[PDB]
Design an enzyme around this catalytic site. Sequence first.
Site, PDB file in Angstrom:
ATOM      1  N   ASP A 254     -10.593   2.833  -4.385  1.00 37.12           N
ATOM      2  CA  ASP A 254     -11.065   1.589  -3.787  1.00 37.12           C
ATOM      3  C   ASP A 254     -12.507   1.299  -4.176  1.00 37.12           C
ATOM      4  OD1 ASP A 254      -8.613   1.740  -2.511  1.00 37.12           O
ATOM      5  OD2 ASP A 254      -9.468   1.932  -0.493  1.00 37.12           O
TER       6      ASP A 254
ATOM      7  N   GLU B 259       0.319  -0.616  -5.244  1.00 36.59           N
ATOM      8  CA  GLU B 259      -0.629   0.482  -5.436  1.00 36.59           C
ATOM      9  C   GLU B 259       0.061   1.757  -5.928  1.00 36.59           C
ATOM     10  OE1 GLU B 259      -4.051   0.598  -3.179  1.00 36.59           O
ATOM     11  OE2 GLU B 259      -3.421  -0.868  -1.677  1.00 36.59           O
ATOM     12  N   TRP B 260       1.266   1.628  -6.440  1.00 42.17           N
ATOM     13  CA  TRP B 260       2.108   2.701  -6.947  1.00 42.17           C
ATOM     14  C   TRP B 260       1.361   3.677  -7.871  1.00 42.17           C
ATOM     15  CZ3 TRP B 260       7.394   1.049  -9.585  1.00 42.17           C
ATOM     16  CH2 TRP B 260       8.109   2.195  -9.960  1.00 42.17           C
ATOM     17  N   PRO B 261       0.796   3.236  -9.011  1.00 41.47           N
ATOM     18  CA  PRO B 261       0.107   4.215  -9.875  1.00 41.47           C
ATOM     19  C   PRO B 261      -1.008   4.968  -9.176  1.00 41.47           C
ATOM     20  CG  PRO B 261      -0.357   1.973 -10.574  1.00 41.47           C
ATOM     21  CD  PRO B 261       0.761   1.887  -9.609  1.00 41.47           C
ATOM     22  N   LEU B 262      -1.811   4.284  -8.353  1.00 40.99           N
ATOM     23  CA  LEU B 262      -2.891   4.938  -7.625  1.00 40.99           C
ATOM     24  C   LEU B 262      -2.380   6.101  -6.777  1.00 40.99           C
ATOM     25  CD1 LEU B 262      -5.743   5.263  -6.574  1.00 40.99           C
ATOM     26  CD2 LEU B 262      -5.344   3.309  -5.036  1.00 40.99           C
ATOM     27  N   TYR B 263      -1.263   5.906  -6.080  1.00 44.22           N
ATOM     28  CA  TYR B 263      -0.741   6.947  -5.203  1.00 44.22           C
ATOM     29  C   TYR B 263       0.093   7.979  -5.942  1.00 44.22           C
ATOM     30  CZ  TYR B 263      -2.500   4.565  -1.118  1.00 44.22           C
ATOM     31  OH  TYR B 263      -3.335   4.031  -0.155  1.00 44.22           O
TER      32      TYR B 263
ATOM     33  N   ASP C 134       0.827  -1.191   0.000  1.00 41.46           N
ATOM     34  CA  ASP C 134       0.000   0.000   0.000  1.00 41.46           C
ATOM     35  C   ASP C 134       0.872   1.256   0.000  1.00 41.46           C
ATOM     36  OD1 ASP C 134      -2.321   1.410   0.000  1.00 41.46           O
ATOM     37  OD2 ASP C 134      -3.102   0.466   1.824  1.00 41.46           O
TER      38      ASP C 134
END
Lengths: 392, 390
Positions: A200, A172-176, A139
Amino acid sequence: LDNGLARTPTMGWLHWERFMCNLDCQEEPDSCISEKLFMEMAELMVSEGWKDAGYEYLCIDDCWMAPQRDSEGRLQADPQRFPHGIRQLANYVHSKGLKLGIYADVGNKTCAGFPGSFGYYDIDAQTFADWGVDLLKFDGCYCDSLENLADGYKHMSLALNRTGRSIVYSCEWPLYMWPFQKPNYTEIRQYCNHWRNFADIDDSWKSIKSILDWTSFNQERIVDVAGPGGWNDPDMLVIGNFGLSWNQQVTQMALWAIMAAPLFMSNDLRHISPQAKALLQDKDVIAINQDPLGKQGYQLRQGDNFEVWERPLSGLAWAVAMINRQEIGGPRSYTIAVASLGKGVACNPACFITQLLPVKRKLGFYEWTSRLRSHINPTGTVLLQLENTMQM
Amino acid sequence: LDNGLARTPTMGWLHWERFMCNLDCQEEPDSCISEKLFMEMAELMVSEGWKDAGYEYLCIDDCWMAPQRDSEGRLQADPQRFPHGIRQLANYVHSKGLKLGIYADVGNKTCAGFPGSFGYYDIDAQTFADWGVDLLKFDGCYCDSLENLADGYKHMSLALNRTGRSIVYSCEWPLYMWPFQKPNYTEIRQYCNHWRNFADIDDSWKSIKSILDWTSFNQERIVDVAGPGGWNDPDMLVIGNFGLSWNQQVTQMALWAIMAAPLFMSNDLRHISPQAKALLQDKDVIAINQDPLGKQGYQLRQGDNFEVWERPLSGLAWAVAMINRQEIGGPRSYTIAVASLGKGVACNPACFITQLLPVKRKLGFYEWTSRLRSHINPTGTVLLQLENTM
Ligand SMILES: *[C@@H]1O[C@H](CO)[C@@H](O[C@@H]2O[C@H](CO)[C@@H](O[C@@H]3O[C@H](CO)[C@@H](O)[C@H](O[C@H]4O[C@H](CO)[C@@H](O)[C@H](O)[C@@H]4O)[C@@H]3O)[C@H](O)[C@H]2NC(C)=O)[C@H](O)[C@H]1NC(C)=O
Ligand SMILES: *[C@@H]1O[C@H](CO)[C@@H](O[C@@H]2O[C@H](CO)[C@@H](O[C@@H]3O[C@H](CO)[C@@H](O)[C@H](O[C@H]4O[C@H](CO)[C@@H](O)[C@H](O)[C@@H]4O)[C@@H]3O)[C@H](O)[C@H]2NC(C)=O)[C@H](O)[C@H]1NC(C)=O
Ligand SMILES: *[C@@H]1O[C@H](CO)[C@@H](O[C@@H]2O[C@H](CO)[C@@H](O)[C@H](O)[C@H]2NC(C)=O)[C@H](O)[C@H]1NC(C)=O
Ligand SMILES: *[C@@H]1O[C@H](CO)[C@@H](O)[C@H](O)[C@H]1NC(C)=O
Ligand SMILES: *[C@@H]1O[C@H](CO)[C@@H](O)[C@H](O)[C@H]1NC(C)=O
Ligand SMILES: CN1[C@H](CO)[C@H](O)[C@H](O)[C@H]1CO
Ligand SMILES: CN1[C@H](CO)[C@H](O)[C@H](O)[C@H]1CO
C-alpha cells in the site's frame, strides 16, 4: 479482463489513503467514512473540473459495511453512517455524471474486519449490480489458502459477469500471492481489469521510491502483461496531501503516466492547493497516461542516482521521464543522445520535443544524431514528449 | 564559549547543503563555489529582508581553498573562483552590514581533500583574523586520533582568542568523537560557540526525523549544557529547496526554534518561493529561537505517533510544538491538559495561547484546568506560544 472496460487505465477517486477506516463521526465528522463525505466529494468532482479532466469513478474503500449481513444474507451499508443506502448513493453519483465504486474482500472478512464475500460471491455481485455499482475493488484479507484466493477472484469475476452489469473489476490477487508463490499474470489478466502488485502507498516519498523501485526491479515480469482491459496497479495518487514536496508530487504524476497506472486520487478535494489541482488535472500528462496504444512504459537506464524511463505512445510518439534520485544539492545536469530514446525510432529522422513537467515548454527539433540536455531537481522528474517528424 | 558572541543562536546562510563542492565554473558558472555566488547571496540577504529578519552571517563551507598553501605557508582561496581573495570578499560583506564565515578542518585535509589546519592552527587563526573573518566552522576529517581531535579543537579555540578578533567558533568535535567516546559537553562548551552532534542533514524528511530522534534520544546529555554562548547545532535549515513538503518545512522551522538551534539556511536566495521565504522570515518563530534566556527546549511526550516538545522562554512564557509522525491519513487530533505543559506553571492560573504555525491564530485563554485540542497534519507540526496571565 475482456468486459469492454478499462480500455484506458481507470481514473477516479478512492478514499483509503486520506480517510482510511475512520468510524468516529461524533468526534471526527469531517473525515469519518459516511455517505455525506462521498456526496460532497461527488459535488466537488463535478464543480472543480475533476470529471472534465477524466476522473470518473468515485470509489468507496473498506469500512462502509454494517457489522453483519441482513436477514436475507445480503451485505448492508452501515445504518448510522450510510443511512440512505448504496443504491441511493449510486443514484446521486450517476445524477452527477459519475460512476460509483465499492469495496469487498475475497475471504471471510474485509481487512478491517467487516463481512467478507466468501460464500456470497454471486449474492454479493448481484447485490452490487442491483445497487448500481460500477466498479469493485476486491481485497485479499482472511483467505484460508492460495487455492481459495484464486478460486474466489475467478468466481467473483464470473459472478459480476453474470449480472450483465458492466463493472470494473479491481483485484489485489497478485499482492496477496507473494507470501506463498509468485503470480501468474496471464491468468490474473484473464480475470481482472487491474491488479495491485505491491504494498500500500502512504503519504511519503519513501513509499513512492519503494513502489518505483519494485516496479523497475520486476519490470520484465509485469510490463508486457499490461494493456487495454488489464493494467498493473501501483496504488493511489497521493498528490494534494501532506508528505510530498512539489518535486515529489511531479515525480508521482509523471511516473504514473509512464506506467499506464490507473489514476485513483486519494486526497480531500475540499482542501487541495491550486498547484496540486493543476498537476492532477494536467491535460498533456493525463493524455500520456490515457494513450490509446496502452503499452506500459519501463525503466530504460539507471545510474549515478539518475533514472530514465520511457513509454511508447500511439503514432510513433514517446514519453520520457528523467528522475534525480540524489537527495542533496541542487538541480543536476543530465544529457542523453536522442538516438538512445524510443528504441532509436522516436527521433528518426527527427523529433519535436516538448517538456511537460515540471513546467511546459517547447524544446524544439532534435535530429537523430543530436543530444538532449536537461537539469533535474532533487527527487524531481523532467517529463518530455517526443513526436516523430520529418520536418526540421 | 565565553567570547561574548552567540549570546543567541547564530543566524545566517551556509552554502554546503544546496551548493556542495561544485568546482565546475565552466559548465555551471551560476552554481559553482565562487566569490560571485557569495556576493549574490550577500546582496539578496540585504535586499530581500533576510538581514532585517536576523540572518547576519554569510558563511563559506568546504571547497573555497586553493589546492596548496602559499609561499609563506598560509591558506589561500582558489585563484580562479575567488580572484580577489577572502579579505576583499569580507570587506564587501561588511560593507553590507553582514558578517563572513569561513571553513577549515582540524586534521590534515578538509573532508573534500583541501589543505587541513593540523600543524598550522595559529597561522590559520591569524590569517582568518587578518582577512576579517567573523566565524569559523571547523570540520573533523583526516584526524588520526581522539587526542589530536580534542587538542586541535582546543588549540584552535585558543588561537582564535589570541588573535584579538571576535570570531564565532563552530565545532564538529562531538560528531567526530561520538563513534568512539562519549563527548564531555561541559568541556566542548568551554571551547566552542556551537557544536555539531549528528550526521549531516540533507534535502529529505528522513534526515529531519533522524535529527529529531537523535536529539530526543540524547536530550538528557545535551539539553542543559546549551545556553548563551554555546549551542547544540542540529545542522542547516533546508527550507526552500526540493525535498520537503510544506508541512515538513514547518516542522523544521518549529523544531529548530524549540531546540535553540543556530539557523543557517542552505538554499538558493535567488530562487526561493514566497511561502518558504515567509516561513524562514517568520518574526514570531525567530523570536522564539532567539529568546534571550537561551534555554533549549526538549521532548515532553511521545506516543501514538505524536510528539510534544516544549521550550521555556523569558518572562514566564513557553513555546510548545506538537508533531504528527503518522505518515498516512489526514489531520489527526491530539489533546493535552495544559497543566501538563511548562512543568505545571505555564498556565497556572491561566495562560493565553497563540498558535504560530502552520498559521498564526489566537486560540484564547486557557485555565489551569483546561485541555488544549489540535489537529496536526501528517509530518507537520503545530507550534504554540503560551503566556501566563499573571
Ligand atoms: C461477460 O464476459 C464476456 C466474455 O467472457 C464479455 O463479452 C466479451 O467482451 C466484449 C464485449 O464488449 C467483446 O469484445 C467485442 O467484440 C465485438 C465483436 O466483434 C468487437 O466488435 C468489439 O470491438 C470493439 O470494442 C473493443 C473494446 O472491447 C475495441 O478494442 C474495438 O476496437 C471495437 O471498438 C469487442 O472486441 C467480446 O467479443 C466478448 N466475448 C464473448 C461474448 O465471447 C461480456 O461483455 C461480459 N459481460 C459483462 C456484463 O461484463
Ligand atoms: C578570550 O577569552 C577571554 C576569557 O574567556 C574572553 O574574556 C571574556 O569576555 C566576555 C565578553 O567580553 C566577558 O563577559 C563580560 O564580562 C563583563 C565584566 O565586566 C560584563 O560587563 C559583560 O556583560 C555583557 O553582557 C551584559 C549582560 O550580561 C550586558 O550588560 C552587556 O552587553 C555586556 O557587554 C560580559 O558578561 C568575560 O568576563 C571575559 N572573561 C575574562 C576572563 O576576561 C575574551 O572575550 C576572549 N577574546 C576573544 C577575542 O575572543
Ligand atoms: C568535563 O570537563 C570539565 C572541564 O574540562 C570538567 O570540569 C572541571 O573539573 C575540574 C576538576 O574536577 C574543576 O577544577 C573545574 O572547575 C571543572 N570545570 C567546570 C567548567 O566545571 C568535568 O569534570 C569533566 N567531566 C567528566 C565526567 O570528565
Ligand atoms: C498461466 O495461466 C494461463 C491460464 O491458465 C496458462 O495458459 C499458462 O500456461 C500459465 N502459466 C504457467 C507458467 O503456468
Ligand atoms: C597528519 O599527518 C602526520 C603525518 O602522517 C601525522 O603524524 C599526524 O598525526 C596527522 N595529524 C592528524 C590530526 O591526523
Ligand atoms: C488493507 N486493504 C485496505 C482496506 O482495508 C485498502 O483497500 C488497501 O489498499 C488494502 C490492502 O491492499
Ligand atoms: C563533510 N563536511 C562537509 C564539508 O566537507 C560539510 O561541512 C559537512 O557539514 C561536514 C561534515 O559534517
